[PDB]
């Protein structure tokens, strides 16, 4: 839980699954807060939920580029999510 945020499981009928997160996705940011470790993510989700933020942008990574397209510039991974209600004990739905 102090390892890099590498998604393993995708919880069924959850936010993460509905907005379409796949196994292997590496979340690097949320709104904001730099995500390096799982701790930073947990903290950020709670902060945002109590801040009253209902929706925000989740940035991740998926796969390596094709050869001769290493240095290519494109949108990182703009993906808008609903923030889980921590009061109602709601989860995002990801686990290593």
């Amino acid at each position: 839980l102090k390892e890099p945020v590498v998604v393993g499981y995708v919880q069924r009928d959850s936010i993460a699954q509905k907005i379409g997160i796949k196994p292997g996705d590496k979340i690097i940011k949320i709104n904001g807060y730099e995500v390096r470790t799982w701790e930073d993510l947990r903290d950020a989700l709670i902060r945002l939920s109590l801040d009253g933020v209902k929706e925000t942008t989740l940035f991740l990574e998926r796969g390596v580029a094709m050869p001769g397209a290493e240095d290519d510039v494109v949108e990182v991974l703009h993906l808008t999510i609903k923030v889980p209600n921590v009061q109602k004990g709601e989860e995002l739905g990801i686990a290593p």
Partner: antibody
Amino acid sequence: EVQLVESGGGLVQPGRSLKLSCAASGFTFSNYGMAWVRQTPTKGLEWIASISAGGDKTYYGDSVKGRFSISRDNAKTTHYLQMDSLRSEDTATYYCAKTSRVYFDYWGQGVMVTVSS
Amino acid sequence: QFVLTQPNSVSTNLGSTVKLSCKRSTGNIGSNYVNWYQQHEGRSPTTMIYRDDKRPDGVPDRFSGSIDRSSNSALLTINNVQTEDEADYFCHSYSSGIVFGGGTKLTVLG
């Protein structure tokens, strides 16, 4: 206005030099890497060469024996494919392409290259 | 390192659905992205599907891409097939190099 225009193709004798051009326009040239793909009647699509956006590295196909060399000229927003030691197998339609990280988003019209005596 | 396998030709009726297959030889299908290109007889290839399943706004909705993990293959589903689909459909992926498919050649009966 995304366009990729090929040129410099036609006819050449086996084991000789020929340089293909591919002028690009209507997008930041130095932001995206370039490529080349040929299409014969039989083989179909078959990747040849790819340069990076920064032009730090170049990549080639397995059906080339390090004979061709891919360059780019950001000044004229053009990229080139020099070809040496050609053969009758190399006779194909040569499309140039534009990369977008994980695929070829745009292709050119293609130019005919024929190797014969 | 790997290669892809496509049907040399396929046929379908006007209004029918069709599944064009693309089977990988070695490696995990999902680890490296898979893309799909249409090409009419004597035309430049155009993007049907990229990043596995993502369709570029412009291509009809009836087209769709998928990743069948069981067969280590990619598939292209075309609902309510039209006459304008009379074209070759190549699949594409990469790793250390860049690979294309054999070339599926769709025909439209009716």
